[PDB]
């Protein structure tokens, strides 16, 4: 089927492989590709692509990118997705001066929570939530993308890969080297993005693991046994960590209302056992007046 496509341009590079904007010559459908130069005398089909395809064939949801076809030749591999108009990071950059209106931020967060709740209800961890992987269209919708780092988990989870999350959106339990990690990490990511949507700048733009930890501490206070039981026993925990006091969120996220501050506090909770679930977050009072405004690229 791969002679049936006109490459229009290169969009960017994702978790793995190159992404092109292309058009179907027979149906006119505009789609996005994902090209993976496979190889021979190598490891073959990468695990990222395997996981992405296998999991996206199961995840049919309005707020999750629809995978239309997989064109599987012996030399290369092509994934075909619905084409979305923009990613969240360019939209933030274009809005770094005017800002995203509160109704639009609320609608985007609501949709993201719906998608993540679907993913978690289908035993899938995304593990790479960030603005580059959040795509928007001209009709006000937003979708989760690029499950290359995603993986299907099981009931009581076992030890998974540790070197998994974009640094700025990595949950504290990962930075501290906890043995078991779960849905909570994804929630954490959205939290950061939520803040990054209001302030229009990264909440915890760390340049190293320790810097990320220290920024999280300076913003939310250095965790102890009270707020997070067991923190002192984790492998990468140090009692020599500086003890910062918790900042009132009224200073962390100024433009946010009382309900929004409550939701953000529940999303950035230290104890993953305590952190709000996406399903529970959908019922927060913050979303009682939810709408679906238009972004206007």
């Amino acid at each position: 089927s791969m002679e049936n496509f006109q490459k229009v341009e290169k969009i960017g590079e994702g978790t793995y492989g190159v992404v092109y904007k292309a058009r179907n010559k027979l149906t006119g459908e505009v789609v996005a590709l994902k090209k993976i130069r496979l190889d021979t005398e190598t490891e073959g089909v990468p695990s990222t692509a395997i996981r992405e395809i296998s999991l996206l064939k199961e995840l049919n949801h309005p707020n999750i990118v629809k995978l239309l076809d997989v064109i599987h030749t012996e030399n290369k591999l092509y994934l075909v997705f619905e084409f979305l108009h923009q990613d969240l990071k360019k939209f933030m950059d274009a809005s770094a001066l005017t800002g995203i209106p509160l109704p639009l931020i609320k609608s985007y967060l609501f949709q993201l929570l719906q998608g993540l709740a679907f993913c978690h209800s289908h035993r899938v961890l995304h593990r790479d939530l960030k603005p580059q992987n959040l795509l928007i269209n001209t009709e006000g919708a937003i979708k989760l993308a690029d499950f290359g780092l995603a993986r299907a988990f099981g009931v009581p989870v076992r030890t998974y890969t540790h070197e998994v999350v974009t640094l700025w959106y990595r949950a504290p339990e990962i930075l501290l080297g906890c043995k078991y990690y779960s849905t909570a990490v994804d929630i954490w990511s959205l939290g950061c993005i939520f803040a990054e949507m209001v302030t229009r700048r990264a909440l915890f733009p760390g340049d190293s693991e320790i810097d990320q930890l220290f920024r999280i501490f300076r913003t939310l206070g250095t965790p102890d046994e009270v707020v997070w039981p067991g923190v002192t026993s984790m492998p990468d925990y140090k009692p020599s960590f500086p003890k910062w006091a918790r900042q009132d969120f009224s200073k962390v996220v100024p433009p946010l209302d009382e309900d929004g501050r409550s939701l953000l506090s529940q999303m950035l909770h230290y104890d993953p056992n305590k952190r709000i679930s996406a399903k529970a977050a959908l019922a927060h009072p913050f979303f009682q007046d939810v709408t679906k405004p238009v972004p206007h690229l």
Partner: protein, 261 residues
């Protein structure tokens, strides 16, 4: 919360659906000209040896067996190539489930250079095409790990013996292809519970799954016969694997003479 409860139910329900779609054809071995159930049992025993050799997860072995069964349901394969299939599947599951999957060279090595790296990669390609990339299949292990949470005070021996029986069910295509993974998991759990503690399939699991002891009875009978005949079975790698203290050596426990069902 590491036993994620807020989405707990949904996941189970979803698996109960998915296990129906990934089911291979029950009588596919009857349509295969060159292979038999015994050859498949030898392949699965070798896969157990491989998983223990590279210290792979049990879920990986279960996924590999599921892939092999689903592939052989629609593709006729000669015996001289059977291992290749069983290799590629074991590779794919390793890429899907394992953090550090063994590299292709190691899989070629464990075949004793029976096949080439090119052959293994091309068989991986073919298996992916045949299975339409539906590799996230529910396993007996995935249901066992959920059934374990309903234990009145948990027992290491019960868990190890249930996992042992679940792995044993993989060897014999006849008759264990008749039963769904959830049913096999329930039967193994009840058998281990009755063997160690004498307790029965708990009410909480009846409410959760909808399976009753009467419904599990046929799988219980088949699995009990398999458990009783295990020492005499031609394939023994699972018993050797479960001799170790890692599974508390539950393989050498005395099975009950009757189930009083």
């Amino acid at each position: 919360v590491n036993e994620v409860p807020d989405y707990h139910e949904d996941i189970h329900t979803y698996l109960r659906e998915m296990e129906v779609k990934c089911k291979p054809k029950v009588g596919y071995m009857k349509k295969q000209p060159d292979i038999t159930n015994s050859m498949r049992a030898i392949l699965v025993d070798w896969l157990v040896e491989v998983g223990e050799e590279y210290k792979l997860q049990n879920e990986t072995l279960h996924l590999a067996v599921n892939y092999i069964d689903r592939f052989l349901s629609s593709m006729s394969v000669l015996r001289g190539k059977l291992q290749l299939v069983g290799t590629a599947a074991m590779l794919l599951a390793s890429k899907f489930e394992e953090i550090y999957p063994p590299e292709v060279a190691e899989f070629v090595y464990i075949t004793d250079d029976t096949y080439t790296k090119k052959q293994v990669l091309r068989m991986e390609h073919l298996v992916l095409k045949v299975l339409t990339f539906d590799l996230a299949a529910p396993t007996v292990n995935q249901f066992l790990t959920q059934y374990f949470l309903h234990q009145q005070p948990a027992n290491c021996k019960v868990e190890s013996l249930a996992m042992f029986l679940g792995e044993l069910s993989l060897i014999d295509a006849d008759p264990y292809l008749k039963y769904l993974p959830s049913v096999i998991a329930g039967a193994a759990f009840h058998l281990a519970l009755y063997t160690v503690t004498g307790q029965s399939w708990p009410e909480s699991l009846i409410r959760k799954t909808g399976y009753t002891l009467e419904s599990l009875k046929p799988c219980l009978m088949d699995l009990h016969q398999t458990y009783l005949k295990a020492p005499q079975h031609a394939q023994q790698s699972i018993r050797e694997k479960y001799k170790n203290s890692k599974y508390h050596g539950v393989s050498l426990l005395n099975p009950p003479e009757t189930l009083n069902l």
